[PDB]
Each structure stands twice: as C-alpha cells, then as structure tokens.
Symmetry: C4
Subunit: 388 residues, 4 copies
C-alpha cells in the first residue's frame, strides 16, 4: 500500500531447490491447455504467478498447426496460478501483443504489450488494469522488450526496449516509468554492442540486467541501472565461461568490453546473479542447441577475465530441451535478504520435434538455498508420440 524499496542484499546461494513446475504439455495432451512460449514468473505482495504469450489455441486443437511463427494478431500476455497449466478456463489476460514485460510496484501492477506489423508497431502501458501510455515505433523494425519482469524502486520501474536490426546496430532506450507515465528515457550507453531480451533483478537500490547480444557476443552484456538518479551503464561479463547459445567452446581468457567472437546473428535469452564471490551463471549444456541447462558458481564473473567454475548444479540434462531462462525474486517475502530465483522454458514441438505441427513449452523454476542440497533433473516429461 506504499511503494517497495530495494533495501536488502542477496542471500548466499549455496545450491538451488524446486520452486514451481507446471507439467503443461503432459496434462495438455488431454486438457484445454493453451499453446505458449516466452514464459516468466512475477510476484505480487500476496501471490507469485506464471506468465506467458498465448497463441490463441489449445495444443490439441487444429489451429495449433503453425504456432512456430512469433507474431500475429492472436497472441496475448496471460497469467495463471503458480504451478498450474495455462488452461482456457483459468488464465487472466493482461494485454494483447506479441512481446511483453510486467512488474508490481507495491501499490499495483504495470504491464506492457506490443502489437503491430514489423514496420508499424506500438507499446501500450497498462497500470492497475487500465491503458495509460502508448509509445510508437522509433526505428521501424520490430519494437520489442524484455520477455520477463521489470523491477521497481520507490515508484520508478525502468524497462529496456530495442527497436531496429537484430543483425547489426539497433536503437535501444531505457524508459523510467512511474505509475504508467514516462518520467524520462535515455538511449543505451557504455560499451555493449547490441541488446535484446533483458533478464533483470534489484538489491540495495540498484538494478542489474543480463541481456542478449544477438549480432556478435557469445559472452552476455550487462546493463546496471540506478532507479533514483535514473542513469545506467553497460559492459560485458568478463568471464571466459561463455553463456549464450550457440557459442564456441570456452577460452582461457574472456572479454570485458568487447563481444567474444565465434558465432554471429542468433542467441537465447538468459540471466546471471552477479554478486562478487556469490555469483552464479546459468547456460545451455549444448554449445549448438538449446538442450540441457546448468547453473555454475564463477566467483567475480563480471570483473575477472580468467574466472573458472568453483561449484555447479545440473538443472536439465543434455538429452532434453531447454529454451529461454530469466530472473525473478519475491521482494515481499519475510527475511533479512532477497532469495534469488529463475525459470527455464522447455520447448517441445518445432523446430527440433518436426513430427508435430505445433510449438509449445512448460516451465520449471527454482530458488536459492544456503544449504548444500542434492540435485535432480527436471525435464518437460511429455512423449511427443502420444500426439500423433
């Protein structure tokens, strides 16, 4: 009932524990479950919820054929109860569009959807279930945003937007919103060459986003935002542990202010928790495809260009598919510190499972533990052959 403020630091992450899992495509083989992709999680002061971009069809209905394509007029941002499947009967529609981000400021929720032709898109900013501000395309080539939650501090919620090429220079701007109104916006600054799909968190009055360079880095770019002064900077994560996909093998030394060369023009959304010695990175196991997922503790990843792993935990084995991953935390949980959390999208269907005509996914999510806990793997679990 007053605005949240990032007062705490992160707890120490000694391992990760299961937080949510919806088993969507299993249950979707015989229930009215919606086809989705681009998932995230976001909390409110009294409940956390699962989020995604619908495709306007059930998995087993005939309009599922073709849902590999990303933008169209039938997609919408939807949220459902934690660890339930996105079902026709139990989902809330937030706004209409094919790209999105959402966060609670402590009083109410802000949600952003973007819709349009490639060359004439727009974003409209919803605050307390109502349309309030609208922005139109500035560079005229797919105005897109985070695909996971934003973070607010005392009313200001910064969002990163990118408009222009995915294959060369683009135009990225950080917008600072308070109650749906634009307070100010800046263009991208610092040394990062290209920004797409930022995964963000906040602690001790500072916001950290780990993003996706699609043009040329296999190492990830980092934007650090100050919500009071409303300024930002960018860098790349120095560590030679590379974390985009596809990517070349890991080198011995890495790069702090330049992209690491090797693959060009493709990527995946990812995250990291950058906190000195208490720094963990997530990545696909495969260097060629989005398959397998693992967490690795690389002390001082951001600042040391020779930093190797000290500890790890496998989340999805290499034989199963992963997809986008992103950060969230529950800033309304009781405690001295913020507990870190993430999610991994588990895509099933096309492109890799060519025997079906659709593309959908489930979620698995995880939070930290100060305890050193044993691990298990968390695969989607459907058998594609039942859908034939």
């Amino acid at each position: 009932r007053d605005f949240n403020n990032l007062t705490k630091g992160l707890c120490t992450i000694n391992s990760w524990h299961i937080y949510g899992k919806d088993n969507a495509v299993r249950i979707g083989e015989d229930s009215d479950v919606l086809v989705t992709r681009e998932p995230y999680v976001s909390c409110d002061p009294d409940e956390c919820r699962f989020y995604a971009l619908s495709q306007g069809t059930t998995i087993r209905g005939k309009h599922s054929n073709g849902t590999i394509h990303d933008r169209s007029q039938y997609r919408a941002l939807i949220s459902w109860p934690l660890s339930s499947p996105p079902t026709v009967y139990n989902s809330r529609v937030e706004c209409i569009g094919w790209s999105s981000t959402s966060c609670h400021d402590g009083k109410t929720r802000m949600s952003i959807c973007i819709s349009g032709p490639n060359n004439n898109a727009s974003a409209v900013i919803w605050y307390n279930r109502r349309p309030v501000t609208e922005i139109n395309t500035w560079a005229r080539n797919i105005l897109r945003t985070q695909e996971s939650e934003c973070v607010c501090h005392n009313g200001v919620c910064p969002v990163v937007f990118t408009d222009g090429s995915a294959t060369g220079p683009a135009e990225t701007r950080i917008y600072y919103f308070k109650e749906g109104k634009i307070l100010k916006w800046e263009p991208l600054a610092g040394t990062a060459k290209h920004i797409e799909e930022c995964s963000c968190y906040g602690e001790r009055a500072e916001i950290t986003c780990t993003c996706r360079d699609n043009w040329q880095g296999s190492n990830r770019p980092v934007i650090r935002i100050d919500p009071v002064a409303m300024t930002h900077t960018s860098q790349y994560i120095c560590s030679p542990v590379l974390t985009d996909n596809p990517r070349p093998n890991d080198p011995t030394v890495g790069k702090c202010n330049d992209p690491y060369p090797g693959n060009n023009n493709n990527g995946v959304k990812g995250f990291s928790y950058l906190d000195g010695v208490n720094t963990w990175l997530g990545r696909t196991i495969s260097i060629d495809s989005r398959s397998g997922y693992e967490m690795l503790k690389v002390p001082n990843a951001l600042t040391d260009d020779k930093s190797k792993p000290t500890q790890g935990q496998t989340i999805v084995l290499n034989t199963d598919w992963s997809g986008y991953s992103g950060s969230f935390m529950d800033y309304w949980a009781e405690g001295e510190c913020y507990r870190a959390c993430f999610y991994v999208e588990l895509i099933r269907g096309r492109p890799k499972e060519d025997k079906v005509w659709w593309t959908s996914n489930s979620i698995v999510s995880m939070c930290s533990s100060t305890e050193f806990l044993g691990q298990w793997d968390w695969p989607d679990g459907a058998k594609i052959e039942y859908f034939l």
Copy 2:
C-alpha cells in the same frame, strides 16, 4: 459508493490502440465455448467485462445447428472476464432473454432482458442482481432495446426501446430509470424517422446515442439526452460520409433532418463520437455487406452537410467479416478526460459461410490515443474448414 456523474469531456482522439480481443471461435474449435451474437463491453468501478446473448450451446455441440435464428427460449445475457472466450465454466448469467442493455450507476448494475413471443413480450429490469420492474409490450411486435450499454448520470439511466415495425413507422420511447424504478418515459421526438439499436456515451452531463434507422436512412439518426431535465431531441448526422450497411456510395452533400434514400429495410448497429473537430465515425468498408471496418475523422459530421474525411484507421480488412459495433467508455479510469472506446462483432458461420450449420462471433475492442500510432488489422482468425 455514491452515484457517478459525467464531469469530463472526451480526450482528443488522434488514433486507436488494441484494448481487448477474445479469439473465441479459434479457441472454440476445441474448448467449451458458447455460441453468441450481439456483443458489447461495459465497465464497473473496478473491472470492465465482455457481454453477449448466449444461444444455450457450445460451437461444437450439435444444438449449434440452427443458431442463425434470433429469438428463442434458450438465449440469455451473459458476461465474462475481459479478453477471455465465453466459456461454459467462466460466464455469469445476468437475466434470461433475446434483447438486452446494461450499465453500472456507480453504486450497482442495472440489467434489462426481454423475452416473449413476438406479439406478447416483456422486459424485466434487474438492479443489484434482483428483479425490480417489468414492462410489457405496447405495440405488440417485437419489443426490443439497445444491444449495448446504457449511461447513467447521478442515478438516472435513460434507455431507448422500440416496439413495432422495422419496415415502416414504429413506437419508440425513452425511459429514465433510477435504481430500477421508472421515473418518467417520453415518446421519440425531433426529426428522426425510425430508431433501432442505439449505441450511446456521455460527457459533460449530456448523453449522445447514434442509432439505426432501418426503414430508410443510410445516414444515422442521433438522439441527444439530458439526464437532469430528462428530455431528448433527434436529428440525422449531416455528413455525406454514409455509415449504415448496405448503403449507396457517398454523395457530395448529405442530410441533416431527413434520411438519405438509397437502400430500404435493412441495416447494422453502429456508433460515432460526435465532438466538433474531434469527431470520428466507424463503418463497414463494403457498401453491400458487413465486411471490413474502418474509423474516419470527419470534423463536424453532425452539423456540416458537406464534411469529408481528414484522417482514418483500418480496423478490419475488407476480406474479413465484421457485424455490430457500439460505444463504451470507462468512466472510473483516472485522468482529466474520458477516453473513447468501441467494439466490432466479427460474425462467422451463416449466412455467408454456408458450409457450417451455426452462427457465432468474436470481439475485438479499441480505445483512443492522443499519440498518432501505427495500425494493424484485427480479423477473427478461425479457419471454417477445421469445423468440417
């Protein structure tokens, strides 16, 4: 918790932005979605909802065969959450009948359903979920009303009703209700010849309805109601930009107090926002059928008989079906002014898609923007061939 009062004027409409879309018949190909028609939207102080007249069947159930017919004992007014499909499991029934209107007065909701044989129908007025007043047929030939929301000011909610022929003179009365009780009623006055299906809004303590002359105008009639003094007047929109369907081509000069001749005995429900220089009109693109939809800014449409378009925005392309359209606004949104909004029904099935035995529809809805935003088209999106 006290009655709403129309205190504000309209914002300036420089373009329109997507507000809601339910993709009902797509999802209805494999979910328990109800067959409907005659949709509208209506807000409460804390949520806006989608509304329609059910047919008492799912799209894919066998009693869908025959739902082209308009009146029967299995239809009911239902409402569901914004941008969800009218599903068996998620709909609230408001009252039983085949014609309806509904509005919130700031304390609670008033809903009107009408049921009967053609020659012996009645309306019962529900207020705060209970039956309170009942009116019986006066001219004995299909007592019908708005098919979209009414508007209240300090407790008085005027509704327009028509009883009698659709093909010659009829008997139309404006009723003023306060808390479900009739304060007064008048017969239609001014110069409009025939009234059917009024789409209404209010601003600065005045209510404007744009209606449908079914007997002989291709230009639309306008009733202006004063909720304090409880009086009204009618006219036609002077502009030569004609907006009923079917209609002849646009002339050079139009008609303020007479119907424009050309087509006879048929029409569609429509709306306009009549606000001096800030006047927008909606219409089908086809002059022969309900296909395509577009918004056009015609400054001073109501009062100037030579007024041509200054700006426009295509909402549905000509190759896709449209249907009824109607006004709504959210009089409980924060702001200095009322933001204008509308919806378009997108009918699928019979008469035009003769290969199926049913008739159902989806909704797309839109609100204003002071920004000049790019456009996209918003078609239903189902493929009829999947239902064969």
Copy 3:
C-alpha cells in the same frame, strides 16, 4: 448478521415473469455437466443459487446408464450459480446423501442430507459448513425429507420428515432447529392422512407448506407452522381444482379434511401460494403424466370447496415434460412485500424417453409481477436424438 424475521406479507400476483433457466441437458450434450434430479432454488442474503442431488456422473459419461434409480452411495447435494448448468468444475458439495433440504437463517446456512440402506438411514444437520446434529431412522423405511428449502424465523427453522410407508400410514414429525441443534419435535397432527415432500414459504410470522399425500389424495395437504410457539396443523386444500398427478378430472365440489379419491399410491411434488383472494396453484396439464405445467388463480382455494379458476398462465406446454415444482422467495430483497417464486424440474431420459439409458433434468424458475405480463412457454429444449 442477525436472524431474519418474516415481517412482510406477499405482493399481489397478477402474472409471473422468467427468473432463472439453466438449459442444462442442451449444453450437457457437449460439456461436463452432472446428471441430477430433485432440484430447488434457495437464497442467501447476497445471492440466490440453484440446488440438486447429483448422481456422481456426467450426462455423456458411461456411468450415466442406470441413473433412473433414486438412492445409492454416489449422490450428493450440490449448489451452483444462478442460471448456469451443474458442471463438474463449478459446483459446491453441501453434504452426501439421497434426500435433502436447506435454508439460510440470516447468519449462516443449514443443510440436511440423508444416506443409508432403506432400513437403516440417518440424517446429519450441517450448520455453517460443519456437521453438528445427527438423527437416525425411527420407523425403518426410507427416512426422507422435503427436497426443497426450509424457512426460518428468528433462528427457528422447522423441517418436516417422513419415515415409513408410502402406501399406507407413515410416521411424520416436524423438527424445529436453531443453529443446527433440535429445540423440540412433534408428530404430525390435524386431518392430513399422509405427507411426503413439502414445498414451504413464510410471510407475517407464519410458515405454510403444501405437501404430497402419496397414499390417497388427489387434492394436496397443507401444514401451517407457527415458528414462535412451535406448533402446527394440517388440512387439505378444499378447492375442486385438483393438483396432484396422476389425478381424476376436476369435480364440482372438493374436500377440506379428507383426501379426494381417484388414483392411489403415486404422486409428484408441487406447491401453492395460499393468500385469500391472491391464491395461485400450479399443476401438470396432463392428468396421466408429468407433462405440461400451468399456474391458476383460484380465489380462497384452501377454505372454499367449490372454487373455480379466475385467471391462468401456461408455463410449459403439454407436449413437454415437467416433474417436481416447489416454492422459494428472496427474503433479503428490498421492498414492502415478499415477491413469490417457484421452479419446475423438466425431466428428460427414462422412464418416458426410453431410447437413452439415463435420467437428468433442467430448471426453469419464475417470480411474481403486479403487472399483467404476456406469457411464453419454457420447454427443456434438448433433442434426445443427438445423444444416440
């Protein structure tokens, strides 16, 4: 938040208007709708709801075969939102059993289910969602109760129970409950010979029940209960307009304290509103079967043995099936007087539609109007042939 008291008299009933209709078996041809029978309606201070005894199956599931039988361990009292179908996903279970009654006292709800073998049944009295009192069989042959709502006055809610033969003398007791505890009980008194299935209402601190004599009256028995003094009396409705089914034709003179002879050992549950000149009776049109339904104004029916109809209204035409009917009113509606209401069960399936293996029903319900409104007929509306 304090106990309701029957302060008002009835309004004048000049005609009846549609109140609720769920179209259950139509929508049940392709939705997860439960098989039911024995329906009623009952209001709470803030919403009215539909009630019935489930059979533990959907209409289209295979355990529907056999649901003609009345008692078994898979039946339960369930309630759902007004004018919705009894669906798997939207129903609340109240208590487990094959006979039931329920009423709100103004603070919370009392519900009674009965379960057992024929010779060893029991009733348990639920108050504010919890078990509180239990009664066991006294005459050891199907302990049964109202199958529609009870009525409370200042905390006392009388219920009529019958244990013993349906084909000769039985043992009927009126129990007076306050907050789930038994204050007192009496055996049946006055002149009525046999009591089954009472339909009750209250006005001006008195409760009236019209019941079913199954042994030998084609005229109905009436119990009048005083909730303060906790006493009762019985009589039969004097009028020669006979209202049980099956029944012989109407005579010229009727019987006040004896059953009218003609048919023996069978009946249907029914009701009447007995209020001097403002007295209305409901009945099947067919004298042989539960088909058609109509309301008839017979002034002074209770007390005059030569009273003929003055006005009427057809509710269901003779060509369609009806079933049980029962009274309810909304004692929390605003007004100077209690508005009368009823429901009719519309049974479909066996015995009469022998081509299917199941038995289920829908509801239509109606309330009074001081206006003289036109009528329509309200049939179930499913086509049995779609279920083959």
Copy 4:
C-alpha cells in the same frame, strides 16, 4: 489470527457418519480429473479441503500409463474443495514432490514436499505460501514423511521423518517447527523398531501418532509427542486385534513393546483413536490385501494385551478395495470437544486391476457421532470395464 491450542478432549465415539466423498474415478471416466494417490484431508480455520499427490496427468490421457510407480519429477501436492474431484481446473498446487504433510497453525499453513533421487533427496518447508527452510537427506535412502496432516500447538508443529531402509533399521527424527523454522529435532526413542507414515491427532495438549512398522510388526507403533516440552516416546498398541496388512490372524494375547511376528517387509498406512474406554481402531478386513475396511471399538487397546472388540462398523465391504487411511480433526469447529475423523483411500487400477495401465483412487471420509447411527458401505463405485 493467534495460534491454536489443544484445549479439549475427544467427544465419545458411539458410531461414525459420512463426512466427504468425491467419487473421483467415476466422474474421471469423462472429465479432466487428475491421477493421484496418497490422499488426506486437512482443515483451515474457515474450510476443510481434500489433499493428494498428483501424477501430472488425467486418468484418460495417455501419460496415465505407468502411474503405478511412486516417485518421479511430475508429482506435486495439490488441494481442492471438499467432496469435489481433483480436477485440472480446480486444484491448488502447494509444493513439488513425491512425499508430503501439511497443517494449519491458526495463523497460516505449513506444507512440506520432498523431491530427489533416492540417494539425494531434500525437503523444503513452505509457510504462508513461500519457501522458508530446507533439509537434505541424512541417511541417503528415500527421505520420506507422513503422507497426512501434522498437528500444531501454540506455534510448534512436530513432524516425523524417516530416512533409510524399509527392510531393516532406519533413521527417524521428530522435527519441531515454529513458523517454518526448526526449533529442535530429536532421533526416535522408546521401544518401536521401525517407523513409516504416521497418522496423528492432538487433544489436551498432547499429540498421538499411530504409524507403520514396515520391517516386522503386524501390531502398530505409537509415538506420543509433547509439543511444549518437545519430547516423545514410542510403544506398540498392546491389543491382540492386529491392524496392519498383510498380517496373521488375531492371537489371544498381543505385545506392548515388541512387534508381533508373522508377515515381514510390507504394510499400509493406518490410524487409531486411543482414548481409554473410547478407543477405536480401523483396519482392512482381508488379512492378505488392502480390501474392505472396518472400525472396531477395543477398550484400552494401547495398554491391555488381551483386549477384544466391544462394538464395530463396516466402512467398505471386503469385495472392494481400500488403501491408506489417516486421521484428521477440525480444531476450529464450535463445541466442548474435538470430534474425531478419518479418510480411506480406495485404490483402483494396478496392481490388482491389471486390465488398465494406470493407478488412481477416490476418498471417502467420516466423523464421529455420540448417537448410535445405522451403517452403509461406501465403495469407489467405478466400473473398470468402461475404461477399456
């Protein structure tokens, strides 16, 4: 809004009455009902709910094939409304795992799920919908817990956990939690040799659990916990009325501090209400398999090794399947004393109904009565042959 305290003693149990029944597999033959096992019931201050471990599939979906296996990554603790089926659309997920226990302390709910490989499992303790404490495996062979509700007194909720062999000595610890944090833990003490699956209740500031010795007793072990002093003791129920399954026939004398020999290495979860002369025991009728269920009053069962039955009540007949059974009570019900209650799992599918490829169950539950009520039997009621 303050912590519950066990202030009352038990009421006298003179018979048992139906409390809840969900008929899940009947309705599951044609609805989206989840496959489950290991059920229980647990109350909150304002509603009681049904609980179970999901398998991540509907009964009629193809991933039902194989659900006989107990642990996997697709299981979760779920709760639904009392006497409804575990449906996709109406279930709340509590935490992810294949073993669980849950209880309300009067302020909010505590829930524990366990997940892992056999040799590397962990438990995470949820309090007020959030992760708070995590424990890791101590003996490295299936860390498991109660499979029914825990009981709190003034904030302390003791839970029994077992880690190690089911076929020899294991390592069992009683943990005392207050608001999700561990106050203290002890290892098992007293004379019981092996503990698995405790069914617990509390009265007059003491908690009683009746558990399962899997290694070698056909008589059940009892742990008595003091929540203030945080200590416990164990014994076996002296009575010669044996209550595990499988078991040898009943002897003439039984054993208070040693297991009764006869069967080795297998069992079922069960309960008892141990209250001097007012002591009731539940058991399967079959000595070879989980089929039939009955309640028997054996005065002083715990303390007398020659105690025979005085009264009984059959709950499920021998020809039908039963499964796990467990205690619950509603410590927020109005009254002078705690009313005792239990549930029985009714397993259908494999191992015994080998003609289907799945394993699922329904619930029947019961509470006490001071009245001597007649009995009925409460079987699952599905016909397996409809699933072929």
